[PDB]
Design an enzyme around this catalytic site. Structure first.
Site, PDB file in Angstrom:
ATOM      1  N   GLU A   3       1.202  88.920 149.693  1.00  0.00           N
ATOM      2  CA  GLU A   3       1.122  89.077 148.240  1.00  0.00           C
ATOM      3  C   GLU A   3      -0.243  89.739 147.851  1.00  0.00           C
ATOM      4  O   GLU A   3      -0.249  90.595 146.939  1.00  0.00           O
ATOM      5  CB  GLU A   3       1.152  87.747 147.547  1.00  0.00           C
ATOM      6  CG  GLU A   3       2.608  87.072 147.809  1.00  0.00           C
ATOM      7  CD  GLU A   3       2.649  85.625 147.386  1.00  0.00           C
ATOM      8  OE1 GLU A   3       1.565  85.012 147.086  1.00  0.00           O
ATOM      9  OE2 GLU A   3       3.777  85.074 147.325  1.00  0.00           O
ATOM     10  N   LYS A  61       1.969  76.868 134.169  1.00  0.00           N
ATOM     11  CA  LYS A  61       0.964  77.458 135.116  1.00  0.00           C
ATOM     12  C   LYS A  61      -0.341  77.922 134.453  1.00  0.00           C
ATOM     13  O   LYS A  61      -1.317  78.232 135.151  1.00  0.00           O
ATOM     14  CB  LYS A  61       1.609  78.652 135.880  1.00  0.00           C
ATOM     15  CG  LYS A  61       3.033  78.412 136.561  1.00  0.00           C
ATOM     16  CD  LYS A  61       2.921  77.267 137.471  1.00  0.00           C
ATOM     17  CE  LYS A  61       4.116  77.237 138.400  1.00  0.00           C
ATOM     18  NZ  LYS A  61       5.072  76.081 137.866  1.00  0.00           N
ATOM     19  N   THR A 105       7.193  86.656 145.814  1.00  0.00           N
ATOM     20  CA  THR A 105       7.831  85.568 146.501  1.00  0.00           C
ATOM     21  C   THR A 105       7.762  84.306 145.652  1.00  0.00           C
ATOM     22  O   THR A 105       6.730  84.073 145.027  1.00  0.00           O
ATOM     23  CB  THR A 105       7.154  85.440 147.914  1.00  0.00           C
ATOM     24  OG1 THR A 105       7.316  86.703 148.665  1.00  0.00           O
ATOM     25  CG2 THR A 105       7.617  84.184 148.772  1.00  0.00           C
ATOM     26  N   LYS A 150      -2.881  81.593 144.012  1.00  0.00           N
ATOM     27  CA  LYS A 150      -1.559  81.861 144.637  1.00  0.00           C
ATOM     28  C   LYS A 150      -1.514  81.276 146.069  1.00  0.00           C
ATOM     29  O   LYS A 150      -2.529  80.866 146.663  1.00  0.00           O
ATOM     30  CB  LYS A 150      -1.236  83.354 144.654  1.00  0.00           C
ATOM     31  CG  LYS A 150      -0.951  83.841 143.240  1.00  0.00           C
ATOM     32  CD  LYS A 150      -0.754  85.416 143.141  1.00  0.00           C
ATOM     33  CE  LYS A 150       0.324  85.951 144.177  1.00  0.00           C
ATOM     34  NZ  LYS A 150       1.757  85.234 144.121  1.00  0.00           N
ATOM     35  N   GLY A 151      -0.294  81.208 146.622  1.00  0.00           N
ATOM     36  CA  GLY A 151      -0.061  80.789 147.996  1.00  0.00           C
ATOM     37  C   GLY A 151       0.649  79.460 148.135  1.00  0.00           C
ATOM     38  O   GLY A 151       0.838  78.966 149.281  1.00  0.00           O
TER      39      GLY A 151
END
EC number: 5.3.1.6
Lengths: 224, 221
Positions: free
Chosen positions: A103, A121, A25, A94-95
């Protein structure tokens, strides 16, 4: 944004006929999903997608990528998803986009787990990006208060003043931690907190990181 | 049964005017809620209840105990709840009625946390009662298979043929472990399992266990 697309497209090369493929995503995985859909229509690539969010489900169905639940497969061959941060030990946060829980469920069951990112990142130490923590609705405000007392500097995830609700019907509290010197410990400590569903530290998971930058694409191997 | 009521009333003596009080479920704890409701109806008691279950919310509303959620108070002074098993180290199995998640959230926030049970819930070692494990819907069936392969004898919680959906929208898988001689290590391991929201081992939480008897056991805590 152009770098996000080169990374997502490159990752689609790791997908082969007969694979079960986790679909990530977020704005970088989105290009991977697009490209998988393109190969399914142009080449007749035979895959079965397993989703990481309701948005990804809708995108895959529009593209004609066949789907099955994580419940209906015994393992996932290859999953491609983004990351908010990746450290040099191949731990990540993540998130940022709200979908850490599904995920992590799909990533845990993946044989070849790949993150796609742009150069920005890659960080020396995780933590400048606020850590997303998915939390039970009932008692979330009491949990937020406990996190304030602990000095984790919480805020509820909200978009346009609307408190965010995840696909599994929880809230997210982001923690302004600044720096996470031991993300294994800190994740494992958050795992014991009643009222915490899941958190955004993905430690020891990813196998390959595909980094697109101004100079080209680097393919970084975790070598577990 | 007469003893269970006497035990549930005896636990209500920890409730005083002006407290925030957790209101739980259980064959004996039911009598504690009845007694709070009676003190409100007959003795002018002024309390706010915070329930662990929508069956207790209905019970308390019938008795006219004013309620709030855990999010609307600062601390719960006293919680009385039931338990499916309690071991001599004051750990227990809860969640047989499905409410393990709100029970654990209310328990964590409680200053004087009390379990009120009858003798048959006191055990030497936890595990003859199936351990409830509340699980994320997505991937619940795959997780069931992993628990099966680990030898945990899982079964999904279901009523009348319908898989049970908890208040927070999860399923429960009950594990038939038989015996859990190290419940702290086992709970720790579940807390790390991706796909588990919460589990029914309440370890090191309870302050006092009141057993029909009537006997009052003080936990270390």
């Amino acid at each position: 944004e152009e770098l996000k697309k080169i990374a997502g497209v490159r990752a689609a090369q790791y997908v082969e006929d007969g694979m079960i493929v986790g679909l990530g995503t977020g704005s970088t995985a989105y290009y991977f999903v697009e490209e998988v859909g393109r190969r399914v229509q142009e080449e007749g690539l035979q895959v079965i997608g397993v989703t990481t969010s309701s948005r990804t489900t809708a995108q895959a169905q529009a593209l004609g990528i066949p789907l099955k639940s994580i419940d209906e497969v015994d393992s996932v061959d290859v999953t491609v998803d983004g990351a908010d941060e990746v450290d040099p030990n191949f731990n990540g946060i993540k998130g940022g986009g709200g979908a850490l829980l599904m995920e992590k469920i799909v990533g845990t069951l993946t044989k070849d787990y790949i993150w796609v990112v742009d150069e920005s990142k890659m960080v020396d130490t995780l933590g400048a990006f606020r850590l997303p923590v998915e939390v039970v609705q009932y008692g979330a405000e009491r949990l937020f208060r406990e996190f304030e007392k602990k000095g984790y500097k919480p805020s509820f995830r909200e978009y346009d003043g609307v408190r965010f609700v995840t696909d599994m019907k929880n809230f997210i509290i982001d923690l302004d931690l600044g720096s996470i010197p031991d993300p294994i410990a800190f994740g494992n400590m958050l795992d014991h907190q009643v009222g915490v569903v899941e958190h955004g530290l993905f430690n020891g998971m990813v196998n390959r990181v595909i980094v697109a930058g101004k100079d080209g694409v680097r393919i970084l191997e975790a070598n577990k």
